[PDB]
Amino acid sequence: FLLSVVGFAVDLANVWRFPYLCYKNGGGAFLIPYTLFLIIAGMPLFYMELALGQYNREGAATVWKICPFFKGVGYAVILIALYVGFYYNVIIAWSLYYLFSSFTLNLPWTDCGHTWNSPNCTDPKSKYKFTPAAEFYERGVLHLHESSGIHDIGLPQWQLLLCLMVVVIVLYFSLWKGVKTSGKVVWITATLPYFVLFVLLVHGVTLPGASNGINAYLHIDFYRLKEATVWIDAATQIFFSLGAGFGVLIAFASYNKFDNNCYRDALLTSSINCITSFVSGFAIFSILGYMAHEHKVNIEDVATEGAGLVFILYPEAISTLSGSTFWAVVFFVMLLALGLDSSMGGMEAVITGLADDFQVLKRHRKLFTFGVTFSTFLLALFCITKGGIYVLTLLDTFAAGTSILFAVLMEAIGVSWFYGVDRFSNDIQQMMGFRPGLYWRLCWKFVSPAFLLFVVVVSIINFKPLTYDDYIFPPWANWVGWGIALSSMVLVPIYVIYKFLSTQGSLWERLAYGITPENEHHLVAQRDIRQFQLQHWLAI
Ligand SMILES: O=C1Cc2cc(CCN3CCN(c4nsc5ccccc45)CC3)c(Cl)cc2N1
Numbered sequence: 001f002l003l004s005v006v007g008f009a010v011d012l013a014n015v016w017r018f019p020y021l022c023y024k025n026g027g028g029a030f031l032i033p034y035t036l037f038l039i040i041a042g043m044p045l046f047y048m049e050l051a052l053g054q055y056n057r058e059g060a061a062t063v064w065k066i067c068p069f070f071k072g073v074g075y076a077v078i079l080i081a082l083y084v085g086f087y088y089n090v091i092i093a094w095s096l097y098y099l100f101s102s103f104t105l106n107l108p109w110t111d112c113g114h115t116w117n118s119p120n121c122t123d124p125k126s127k128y129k130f131t132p133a134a135e136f137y138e139r140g141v142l143h144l145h146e147s148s149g150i151h152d153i154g155l156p157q158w159q160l161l162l163c164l165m166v167v168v169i170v171l172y173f174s175l176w177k178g179v180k181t182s183g184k185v186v187w188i189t190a191t192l193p194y195f196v197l198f199v200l201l202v203h204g205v206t207l208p209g210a211s212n213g214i215n216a217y218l219h220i221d222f223y224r225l226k227e228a229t230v231w232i233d234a235a236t237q238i239f240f241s242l243g244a245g246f247g248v249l250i251a252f253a254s255y256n257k258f259d260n261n262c263y264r265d266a267l268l269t270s271s272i273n274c275i276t277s278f279v280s281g282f283a284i285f286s287i288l289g290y291m292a293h294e295h296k297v298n299i300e301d302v303a304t305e306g307a308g309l310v311f312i313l314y315p316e317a318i319s320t321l322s323g324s325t326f327w328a329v330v331f332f333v334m335l336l337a338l339g340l341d342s343s344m345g346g347m348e349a350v351i352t353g354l355a356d357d358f359q360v361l362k363r364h365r366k367l368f369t370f371g372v373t374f375s376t377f378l379l380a381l382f383c384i385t386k387g388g389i390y391v392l393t394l395l396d397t398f399a400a401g402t403s404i405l406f407a408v409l410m411e412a413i414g415v416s417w418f419y420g421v422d423r424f425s426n427d428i429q430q431m432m433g434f435r436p437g438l439y440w441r442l443c444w445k446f447v448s449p450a451f452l453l454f455v456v457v458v459s460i461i462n463f464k465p466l467t468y469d470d471y472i473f474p475p476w477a478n479w480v481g482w483g484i485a486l487s488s489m490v491l492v493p494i495y496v497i498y499k500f501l502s503t504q505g506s507l508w509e510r511l512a513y514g515i516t517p518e519n520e521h522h523l524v525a526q527r528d529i530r531q532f533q534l535q536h537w538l539a540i
Contacts (some may be wrong), residue, residue: 004182005265007190008428009272011342012088012335013241015193015306018277019284020309023232027217029224029435033234035274041448042238043106043270045408046441048415048424049244049260054287057428059356060247060349069514070414074353074493076407077247077486081350083399085343085376087392089167090383092339094311096163097141099332107324108140109315110135124294127304128471133316137308147387150394150477154386158192162382164377167340172373174344176349176366179255189341192334200314203321204286213289216299217282228458235455236401241273245404245411248349258431284309287317304469307392317431347372393468400479403488409452410492411444416445418515418531422539445540 022030054061061074091469101108108114112123112132116139120130129138135303138144146154174181204210224230239245254263291302291313303312319329350374361368383392415424421441429435466473496514503510512524515531521530530536 001260002268003186003190005268007186008270009269010189010193010276010338011241012092012338014235014273014276014280015335016091016196016307016310017240018237018280019313020305020307022281023288023303023309024305025233026221026224028220028282029222030230030234031278031281032220032225033231034277037235037238037451038274039271040157040443040537041451042242042244043266044443044448045244045412046242046249046269047262047266047436047440048412048444049249049255051424051428051431052415053082053250054260054262055258055260055431057254058250059254060250060353061238062356063250064414065518067414067515068518069496069499070410070418070492071499072492073407073410073414074247075495076403076410076488076491077245077262078350078353079491080400080407081246081248081343081346081378083395083484085330085346085350086380087395088339088343088346089164089171090388090392091307092167092336092343092378093160093163093384094141095332095335095339096166098159098311099313099336101330102325102328102332105325107319107328109136110319113537114140118145125373126301128295128297128302134303134308134312136315137311142389143386144270144389147385147390149471149474150387150390151474152387153382156384157386159434161381164380164384165344168373170340170376171343171347172369174340175347175373176369179348180351181348185341186345188334192330193338194207196334197276197279197283199327200317201283201286204217204283204290204317207286207290207320209293210290212222212292213285213287213299214282216289217285228462230454230465232459235405235452239404239408240400240408241277244269245346245400245408246346246349247305247353251349251352252345254352263432263434287313291316299380306469308387336521347376348390357431370453389400389473390468390473394466394473394477395484397413397466401485403485405452405456405459406489406492409449409456412444412449412452416449417537419477419535420530420539421445431450441540442471 052063056065058065059074060077063070063394063490064071064074077144109132112121112135117132117135118130118139121132121135122130123132127134129135143157152450205214243249288299288302292299295302303309305441314331315328321327347369351365351369355365355368382388383395385391421444425436425441465478499514500510503513509524512529516524
């Protein structure tokens with residue numbers, strides 16, 4: 001089964017979202033708070049999720065039959081997936097346009113004489129926005145020059161609408177009949193991305209002036225580590241790239257067997273994730289160093305720090321290889337495959353999580369997938385407009401920020417403190433052949449929550465306004481973003497209150513029906529609750 005651990009560790013979050021986060025934070029100084037969070041609270045909250053899903057064969061919302069008070073955490077990890085699906089599909093819509101626009105002998109992003117070119121373009125033969133490759137993305141693809149801000153936003157663009165419809169149709173017809181959407185599409189996302197990355201890495205070392213871009217990647221500065229921004233960016237990116245906190249792992253583990261080894265599958269994914277991220281950063285910074293001996297400017301003053309860094313970088317590196325059309329086609333085919341697989345995984349996670357709860361949607365899958373996909377298309381229509389990059393930035397900043405860390409922290413607290421690390425270890429020993437040990441028990445009970453809470457608190461206290469590289473957002477945009485962020489975090493206490501007023505009895509007999517497994521129904525009456533003695537809470 002050593003193909004899924006290779007075909008799933010890389011997705012559209014290590015080749016798109018990691019480059020610009022590494023570039024913005026400096027490069028190198030971003031890998032110190034990345035490995036720490038991967039070792040401390042990235043592997044344990046992958047092993048725990050896999051074990052929970054494999055033992056309790058339920059989705060991401062009804063798995064909380066071991067502690068009914070915490071069922072709101074299951075509902076709080078579906079809205080985040082919905083938002084991520086919206087802007088994920090919007091972003092995938094660009095790769096189709098770039099692939100279709102590359103079936104020529106002279107690529108559009110190499111010349112400075114096309115219709116969409118302003119009378120300020122400069123051909124070398126904050127950010128410089130007049131370069132031929134960065135002007136294409138801004139004008140002939142996004143049409144950003146017709147929007148004055150987030151308060152203007154024109155009508156949707158008719159050229160990306162067709163690509164969005166194509167992506168929506170592909171997703172629907174992929175997830176319309178069966179859950180097995182992984183046994184025939186893992187032979188393109190497991191081999192091609194590695195080949196393309198290797199070619200790019202082996203080419204980006206002979207470029208003139210490419211040593212100055214790798215002498216800054218392997219150079220640690222100690223003044224960016226005293227500010228609480230990289231510590232939050234790395235913490236969010238770890239959970240974005242690993243899959244924890246979205247409910248995907250539980251849903252995809254509930255369909256496996258009862259003798260699978262989660263230990264090996266958890267230790268064989270983080271290593272590949274780290275290696276892929278390091279290699280991607282190396283290649284990206286090599287290309288950035290190359291694009292400084294041409295414009296004769298500094299490394300920090302080239303390119304953007306937004307979502308278009310890869311679309312500005314990679315087309316400017318394909319043009320140097322011999323046979324540019326072939327490599328462009330291969331690269332964008334790989335991007336399309338990665339995006340489609342990730343979107344399919346997320347949508348399947350949402351659908352399974354919602355269908356395991358209500359049994360009426362389990363018999364109607366074609367009428368439910370259509371509804372989910374149509375809602376996603378309608379709510380993703382916003383980012384296709386003229387000023388859609390502003391909405392994309394707002395969603396990227398606020399959809400999964402503090403909310404995902406809060407959800408993961410609540411998951412860890414509910415699984416450990418209120419259930420029992422002893423009970424979890426006994427279940428794992430019943431399923432597999434061994435016991436979790438001591439490192440994982442000490443990590444999942446004391447160390448991981450102590451870091452997640454610190455990150456959440458320091459992110460709440462140290463909040464900075466929202467900008468896009470030249471544009472300070474209006475003040476009400478921050479209010480809207482915080483409302484979006486709180487829309488997921490507010491679901492945890494609401495379910496607690498509802499379940500407290502829903503049951504019948506006294507306070508002692510109402511608090512005792514939400515801290516015990518649902519199958520131990522005839523134990524509360526005989527006053528047999530193990531959570532009322534210190535021996536349960538004194539077990540490390
Ligand atoms: O068994 C298994 C299954 C499995 C899947 C994965 C991929 C993790 N990725 C998936 C996409 N991600 C989304 N979260 S929400 C959302 C909404 C729309 C589109 C994408 C998304 C981010 C995390 C990994 Cl790395 C290991 C394993 N192991």
